[PDB]
Design an enzyme around this catalytic site. Structure first.
Site, PDB file in Angstrom:
ATOM      1  N   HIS A   1      -0.750 -10.151  -1.621  1.00  0.00           N
ATOM      2  CA  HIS A   1      -1.391 -10.679  -3.070  1.00  0.00           C
ATOM      3  C   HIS A   1      -2.656 -11.138  -2.962  1.00  0.00           C
ATOM      4  O   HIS A   1      -3.560 -10.963  -2.095  1.00  0.00           O
ATOM      5  CB  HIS A   1      -0.512 -11.975  -3.243  1.00  0.00           C
ATOM      6  CG  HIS A   1       0.984 -11.505  -2.968  1.00  0.00           C
ATOM      7  ND1 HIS A   1       1.989 -11.005  -3.826  1.00  0.00           N
ATOM      8  CD2 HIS A   1       1.661 -11.801  -1.827  1.00  0.00           C
ATOM      9  CE1 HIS A   1       3.060 -10.640  -3.171  1.00  0.00           C
ATOM     10  NE2 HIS A   1       2.826 -11.455  -1.880  1.00  0.00           N
TER      11      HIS A   1
ATOM     12  N   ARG B   1      -5.199  -6.481  -2.499  1.00  0.00           N
ATOM     13  CA  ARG B   1      -4.403  -6.679  -3.404  1.00  0.00           C
ATOM     14  C   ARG B   1      -3.669  -5.814  -4.090  1.00  0.00           C
ATOM     15  O   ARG B   1      -4.037  -4.648  -4.333  1.00  0.00           O
ATOM     16  CB  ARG B   1      -4.955  -7.422  -4.525  1.00  0.00           C
ATOM     17  CG  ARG B   1      -4.052  -8.342  -5.612  1.00  0.00           C
ATOM     18  CD  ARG B   1      -5.074  -8.979  -6.683  1.00  0.00           C
ATOM     19  NE  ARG B   1      -4.285  -9.217  -7.885  1.00  0.00           N
ATOM     20  CZ  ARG B   1      -4.418  -9.591  -9.174  1.00  0.00           C
ATOM     21  NH1 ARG B   1      -5.708  -9.343  -9.375  1.00  0.00           N
ATOM     22  NH2 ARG B   1      -3.449  -9.955  -9.977  1.00  0.00           N
ATOM     23  N   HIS B   2      -2.273  -5.919  -4.448  1.00  0.00           N
ATOM     24  CA  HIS B   2      -1.573  -4.959  -4.934  1.00  0.00           C
ATOM     25  C   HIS B   2      -1.972  -4.312  -6.322  1.00  0.00           C
ATOM     26  O   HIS B   2      -2.976  -5.216  -6.973  1.00  0.00           O
ATOM     27  CB  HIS B   2      -0.147  -5.209  -4.970  1.00  0.00           C
ATOM     28  CG  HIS B   2       0.105  -6.485  -6.054  1.00  0.00           C
ATOM     29  ND1 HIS B   2       0.004  -6.522  -7.396  1.00  0.00           N
ATOM     30  CD2 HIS B   2       0.261  -7.740  -5.456  1.00  0.00           C
ATOM     31  CE1 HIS B   2       0.017  -7.807  -7.878  1.00  0.00           C
ATOM     32  NE2 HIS B   2       0.207  -8.744  -6.929  1.00  0.00           N
TER      33      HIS B   2
END
Lengths: 264, 260
Positions: A194, A8-9
């Site tokens: 994401h 995830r970012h």
């Protein structure tokens, strides 16, 4: 042992500063400034000035920190990264770049941007795809993009308010393409995307159909910034399995604003 | 370009996230250090006596290092000139002071003047408190000013001191601090310090304890208080801090087994 590491970012500025973050960091004549140190030092140059960042927001300064410290841990773990894929979201591509820098692979490995693993359009601003940066713009912002990569989907194919099932079908279809891109390769295929991606891109590898949307959703609520899902291929048995990620968790506190006038 | 005092709170300390037994979570049975979570710092400072003493003198978290660096980075941009640096003897304060100096490229030029008189109120600590000595700090690669005679020594810090007794030693220390050496004096210390060390500068008496405490609650990591001296009028006044605030979210742990 070939593997896929989904990441995830880092913290995105609008998570902290809200949906109108851009209005807080823009002058009347459309120029950028930092009203708080967690706004990034700068914004990369983009076509219509800084207008199109509104729904494609950058990492916050904290998100940069998170990305860098995870990349540092990945270097120290010693695992070999053979390729890197990224959602076309700026926050995801920025996270990819920062990891590559800490690995010292920024010049050796190009980022393969895959619009097929973009966020579920139901969870986006207008229940639709925002204007994202072109690959030409990312190169101009000094991102080492792989322009020869032929992605499974163009951004324009992504339907607004697509169903849970449609979102899963395009992530599955994208993961066909991803694995077939350099298939001989062992090493880690890094996918920076994401929260939803931790499930949407590992499920099809494990031979499983999508979870019930509810269970998927409860599971995604709990994925923190730079959370990871790690799947190894057992070559002999022709099977993939979930595994303990190659780095530890990252757990820290928030930091509130303060008004110095209170002291007066 | 006036004389001034910039008071800065240390960054996030590891035990605020990982609790009072943080040391037992990053210690092996034979006393070696490991990182169970990435927010534990890369290493503890090189200390030869062992890690035991860190328990109640905890270092900055990784987040605390980040907070300190991005704050120091913005100070450099603001272009203000730091001439001296004082710091509470707590490791977290000294660590924050070094990180800021590094960002200002002054870690070799300016020596850190450790002042026990601006240590945290002892009613807010564990119980003298168990700190690193000045030789241990020098050993750990900290540029300390050993020549500095502090207004208060480590031994003078007695447990369960009163609010008034804490204010008194802070004002007493500020008398000294101002006399020792027209650039910015940097004070890297604790939340309480932003009030306890600025009131006497302004010529104000201590606040009521409750008003003081209510105000200290709201001071975040790397929070600042900035007094400029009006030499013409012989008065000090609070001024907008030279850098902006730092507002960011939390990060929780996740358990990968939930996915199976």
């Amino acid at each position: 042992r070939k593997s896929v590491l989904v990441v995830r970012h880092g913290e995105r500025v609008d998570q902290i500063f809200g949906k109108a973050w851009l209005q807080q960091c823009s002058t009347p004549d459309g120029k950028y400034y930092r009203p708080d140190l967690n706004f990034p030092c700068s914004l990369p140059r983009r076509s219509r000035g800084i207008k199109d960042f509104e729904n494609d927001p950058p990492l916050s300064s904290c998100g940069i920190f998170q990305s860098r410290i995870a990349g540092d841990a990945l270097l120290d773990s010693g695992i070999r990264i053979s390729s890197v894929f990224a959602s076309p979201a700026l926050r995801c591509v920025q996270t990819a770049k920062l990891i590559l820098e800490e690995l010292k692979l920024e010049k050796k490995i190009k980022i393969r941007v895959e619009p097929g693993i973009f966020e579920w359009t139901k969870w986006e601003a207008g229940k639709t795809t925002p204007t994202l940066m072109s690959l030409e713009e990312l190169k101009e912002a000094n991102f080492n993009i792989d322009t020869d990569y032929r992605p499974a989907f163009p951004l324009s194919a992504l339907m607004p308010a697509e169903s849970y099932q449609e979102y899963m079908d395009r992530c599955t279809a994208s993961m066909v393409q991803i694995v077939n891109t350099c298939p001989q390769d062992t090493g880690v295929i890094l996918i920076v995307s994401h929260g939803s991606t931790l499930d949407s891109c590992t499920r099809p590898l494990l031979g499983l159909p999508p979870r019930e949307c509810g269970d998927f959703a409860q599971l995604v609520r709990k994925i923190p910034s730079l959370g990871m899902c790690f799947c190894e291929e057992n070559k002999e048995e022709g099977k993939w399995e979930l595994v303990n990620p190659p780095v530890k968790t990252l757990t820290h506190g928030a930091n509130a604003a303060f008004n110095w006038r209170n002291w007066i």
